[PDB]
Amino acid sequence: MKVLGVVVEYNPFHNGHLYHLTSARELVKPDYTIAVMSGNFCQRGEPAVIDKFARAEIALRMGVDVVLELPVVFATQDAGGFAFGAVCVLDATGVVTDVVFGSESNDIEFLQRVARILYEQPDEYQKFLHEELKKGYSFPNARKYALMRYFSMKGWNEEEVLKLEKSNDILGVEYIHSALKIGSNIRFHTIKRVGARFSSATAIRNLMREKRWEEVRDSLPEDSFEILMREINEGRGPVFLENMGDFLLSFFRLKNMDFFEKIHGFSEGLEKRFHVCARQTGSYRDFLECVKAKRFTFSRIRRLALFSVFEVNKEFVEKSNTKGPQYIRILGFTEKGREILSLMRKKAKLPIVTNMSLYRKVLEKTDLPVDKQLFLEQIDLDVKATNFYSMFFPSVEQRCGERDFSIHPIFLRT
Amino acid sequence: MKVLGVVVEYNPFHNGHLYHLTSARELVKPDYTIAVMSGNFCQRGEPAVIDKFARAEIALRMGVDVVLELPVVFATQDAGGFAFGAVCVLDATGVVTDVVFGSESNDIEFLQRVARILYEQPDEYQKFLHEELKKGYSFPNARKYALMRYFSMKGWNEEEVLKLEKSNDILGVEYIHSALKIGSNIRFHTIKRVGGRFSSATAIRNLMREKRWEEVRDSLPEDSFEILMREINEGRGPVFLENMGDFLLSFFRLKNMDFFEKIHGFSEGLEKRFHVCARQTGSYRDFLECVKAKRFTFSRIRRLALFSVFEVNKEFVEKSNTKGPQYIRILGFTEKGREILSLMRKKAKLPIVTNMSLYRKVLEKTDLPVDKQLFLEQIDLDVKATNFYSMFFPSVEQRCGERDFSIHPIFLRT
Ligand SMILES: Nc1ncnc2c1ncn2[C@@H]1O[C@H](CO[P@@](=O)(S)OP(=O)(O)OP(=O)(O)O)[C@@H](O)[C@H]1O
Numbered sequence: 001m002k003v004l005g006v007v008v009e010y011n012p013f014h015n016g017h018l019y020h021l022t023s024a025r026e027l028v029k030p031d032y033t034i035a036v037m038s039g040n041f042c043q044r045g046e047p048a049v050i051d052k053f054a055r056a057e058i059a060l061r062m063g064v065d066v067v068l069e070l071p072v073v074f075a076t077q078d079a080g081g082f083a084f085g086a087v088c089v090l091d092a093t094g095v096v097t098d099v100v101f102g103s104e105s106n107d108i109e110f111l112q113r114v115a116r117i118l119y120e121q122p123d124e125y126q127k128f129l130h131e132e133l134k135k136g137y138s139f140p141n142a143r144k145y146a147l148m149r150y151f152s153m154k155g156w157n158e159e160e161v162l163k164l165e166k167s168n169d170i171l172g173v174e175y176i177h178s179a180l181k182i183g184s185n186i187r188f189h190t191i192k193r194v195g196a197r198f199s200s201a202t203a204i205r206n207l208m209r210e211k212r213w214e215e216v217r218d219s220l221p222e223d224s225f226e227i228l229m230r231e232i233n234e235g236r237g238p239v240f241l242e243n244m245g246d247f248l249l250s251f252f253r254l255k256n257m258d259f260f261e262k263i264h265g266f267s268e269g270l271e272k273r274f275h276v277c278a279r280q281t282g283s284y285r286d287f288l289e290c291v292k293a294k295r296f297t298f299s300r301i302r303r304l305a306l307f308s309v310f311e312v313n314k315e316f317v318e319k320s321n322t323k324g325p326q327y328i329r330i331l332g333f334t335e336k337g338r339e340i341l342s343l344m345r346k347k348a349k350l351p352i353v354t355n356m357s358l359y360r361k362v363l364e365k366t367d368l369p370v371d372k373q374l375f376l377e378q379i380d381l382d383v384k385a386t387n388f389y390s391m392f393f394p395s396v397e398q399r400c401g402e403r404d405f406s407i408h409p410i411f412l413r414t
Numbered sequence: 415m416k417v418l419g420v421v422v423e424y425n426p427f428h429n430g431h432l433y434h435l436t437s438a439r440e441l442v443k444p445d446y447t448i449a450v451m452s453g454n455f456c457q458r459g460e461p462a463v464i465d466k467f468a469r470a471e472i473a474l475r476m477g478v479d480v481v482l483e484l485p486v487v488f489a490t491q492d493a494g495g496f497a498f499g500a501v502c503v504l505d506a507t508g509v510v511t512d513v514v515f516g517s518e519s520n521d522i523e524f525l526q527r528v529a530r531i532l533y534e535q536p537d538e539y540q541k542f543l544h545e546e547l548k549k550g551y552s553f554p555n556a557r558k559y560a561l562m563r564y565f566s567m568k569g570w571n572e573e574e575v576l577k578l579e580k581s582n583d584i585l586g587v588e589y590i591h592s593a594l595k596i597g598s599n600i601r602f603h604t605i606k607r608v609g610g611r612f613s614s615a616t617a618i619r620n621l622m623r624e625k626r627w628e629e630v631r632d633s634l635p636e637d638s639f640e641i642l643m644r645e646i647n648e649g650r651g652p653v654f655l656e657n658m659g660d661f662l663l664s665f666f667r668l669k670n671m672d673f674f675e676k677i678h679g680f681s682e683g684l685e686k687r688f689h690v691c692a693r694q695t696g697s698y699r700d701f702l703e704c705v706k707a708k709r710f711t712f713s714r715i716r717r718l719a720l721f722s723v724f725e726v727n728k729e730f731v732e733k734s735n736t737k738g739p740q741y742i743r744i745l746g747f748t749e750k751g752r753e754i755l756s757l758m759r760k761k762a763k764l765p766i767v768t769n770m771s772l773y774r775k776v777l778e779k780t781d782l783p784v785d786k787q788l789f790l791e792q793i794d795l796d797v798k799a800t801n802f803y804s805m806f807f808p809s810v811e812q813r814c815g816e817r818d819f820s821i822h823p824i825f826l827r828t
């Protein structure tokens with residue numbers, strides 16, 4: 001039988017997301033659909049505008065059967081790490097046969113060809129890559145130029161490689177590359193991205209900031225808007241990066257360069273830039289602009305700020321990017337979802353965590369040969385991120401307790 | 415020639431402080447007056463309501479000739495550590511002859527008698543203490559009972575040991591004790607504490623919170639009130655603990671018990687209490703009440719919160735409480751003050767820091783047998799505290815830069 005996996009953030013779940021999910025299901029005709037979803041922080045280094053429990057419920061309402069958390073250590077990395085974590089979780093379920101992602105080109109054959117080269121690492125490609133890195137280009141640029149030069153040597157059209165300047169197709173190549181690395185049999189598919197009625201998740205979050213609520217409503221499915229309003233009515237949203245800005249900036253003034261040198265992703269003089277800009281600027285917005293230069297994107301800097309505040313160190317990320325996620329966290333499922341979750345319990349290659357109050361017992365008793373210390377470090381980060389995030393709920397009445405322990409997986413009858 | 419030393423916090427400088435300074439000057443008739451003053455955080459675990467540069471200027475205008483900073487590692491400790499740092503700084507100037515402190519008993523002979531016992535550690539006293547250290551008693555209590563039982567054996571009145579339940583006389587004993595430890599020749603004196611026109615510093619900060627400025631005005635010398643208004647009008651005040659509360663509470667959610675176990679001052683299950691209360695409560699006020707129990711003072715809990723965010727570890731404090739402050743930091747001086755500073759350059763036992771941009775050069779060039787690593791760690795903490803505190807200036811425009819480097823010692827002309 002067929003099971004559709006999808007890799008998602010849903011920050012917030014909007015019409016474009018409904019378009020993807022519906023397209024994916026109609027294309028593949030799966031018996032079940034499983035989503036692996038970023039938690040309370042997304043890949044761009046921002047908080048989710050409402051939390052993962054709310055967004056899990058929306059995913060269920062929109063046609064997902066089971067929602068899994070993509071652990072924080074992957075959810076907040078650049079595309080390579082993000083993709084690797086996401087494919088490991090989907091593959092580890094033991095049931096996912098097909099994955100569909102939105103694509104600018106909608107050219108799956110092109111993406112598979114590129115993923116194969118990056119997987120096999122032919123020496124001519126490596127030679128080109130090394131030269132470009134030596135020339136001082138950043139890895140994404142160097143890889144691009146190296147692939148182009150490789151395409152040319154092969155008598156292919158190198159201009160086709162320009163498709164990899166588009167974010168979603170880059171991610172696509174990384175999903176496929178990850179599946180190749182871990183030996184997964186998952187079939188990958190593209191669907192065409194449309195619009196940016198379809199506003200980007202970032203535009204919609206900006207509409208919320210400006211309190212243009214009618215336009216927000218026009219951008220989201222009804223159940224998504226309803227849950228968004230629910231969270232806002234109870235003071236659990238919206239949550240914006242700028243709400244965390246004074247914390248981040250103040251926290252960096254507590255740290256010296258020695259600290260940042262241990263944090264994953266620091267290189268190219270970024271330790272000194274974090275150290276100096278933290279002391280010379282008075283707001284996180286100004287901080288970001290101070291650290292920012294030609295060779296750094298805002299998303300890279302914002303990711304580094306999250307890695308710093310959560311003390312996500314180099315050794316921990318190295319192990320996570322080698323051994324992968326050590327557990328499957330269930331954020332929610334439907335009555336129909338029970339059926340595929342039951343099969344996962346038989347077929348999964350990682351321990352399944354439903355009841356967080358039990359996760360240490362799950363680890364102690366599992367037959368699966370996981371890395372115990374890595375498991376504990378990974379899930380501790382997931383919990384820490386939730387606990388930190390909840391301090392920024394607008395209403396103080398919502399800031400108590402550990403929501404990973406107090407909120408069980410969302411459940412909806414079918 | 416006589417130089418009056420005074421140990422002070424001045425948070426803010428009020429009429430009781432003017433009474434003390436006037437009384438001390440009348441008693442000692444000093445040629446010069448040097449204050450050693452807590453920086454931007456005081457001994458009760460709270461931020462100074464305006465910063466150290468403003469309060470140093472107030473001190474000079476009220477008749478102090480030279481203001482020195484009490485380094486943070488001492489300023490934020492309990493009475494023993496606070497006193498030790500303060501007396502070390504004053505003794506290290508090489509010019510201080512007399513120290514006068516406010517006293518509940520105004521009985522200097524008694525305070526001297528108690529410090530002598532603590533310093534000389536009689537056999538009988540040590541026995542009692544070891545007994546009392548068992549039966550679960552914390553040291554300051556076990557000490558009090560050991561002292562009482564000691565007083566009985568010698569045939570003195572043990573009820574008199576209850577004079578040491580009083581805050582100022584506790585400090586008095588510790589100043590004298592510290593002077594004996596380091597072999598200081600400083601003469602200590604008491605003046606009786608008096609108390610309308612006299613409100614405590616805590617009462618005045620609450621008046622400020624409630625915006626009763628006329629009552630604040632009535633509690634403060636004119637120049638003290640004037641500079642308080644200046645800082646407020648210029649967006650550098652007031653600064654209250656509750657302004658830092660969300661930072662502290664959020665920060666504790668980033669930490670596990672292993673972290674608090676390394677922080678100075680943690681014992682008696684306080685690590686578990688910090689950890690659990692941080693996750694169970696939604697505000698720092700609620701956090702503090704959660705941690706509070708009969709055997710804990712709020713001041714101790716508040717101090718521990720400060721040691722936690724500044725990562726003031728057990729070993730760093732143990733060395734500091736052994737070797738003392740490694741530098742004399744000058745916050746301000748008058749014209750008259752320049753004179754005694756000139757003599758200090760010949761007589762001082764620690765390196766003197768005027769220009770913070772030069773402190774590494776000072777440390778490099780000094781012939782004094784300081785601990786260089788400890789010097790660097792102590793002054794790093796002073797700078798960190800200033801930088802952290804400045805993020806809580808009400809005006810965002812005032813939050814940039816490192817004030818320790820941007821603001822030279824205050825110089826007042828006569
Ligand atoms: N307009 C659109 N058309 C088709 N597919 C889309 C889409 N928008 C998203 N998807 C697909 O929906 C899936 C989940 O999207 P995430 O939650 S990972 O958000 P994101 O893609 O970064 O959204 P953004 O910020 O608005 O660009 C992915 O396969 C998308 O390609």
Ligand SMILES: Nc1ncnc2c1ncn2[C@@H]1O[C@H](CO[P@@](=O)(S)OP(=O)(O)OP(=O)(O)O)[C@@H](O)[C@H]1O
Binds near residue numbers: 431516
């Ligand atoms: N009313 C008073 N009478 C006599 N001396 C006093 C005094 N108030 C302060 N002093 C003396 O002034 C000196 C500086 O006091 P800090 O700056 S250390 O403040 P603090 O004493 O904690 O003030 P509080 O919080 O208002 O009780 C000390 O020797 C005091 O004894």
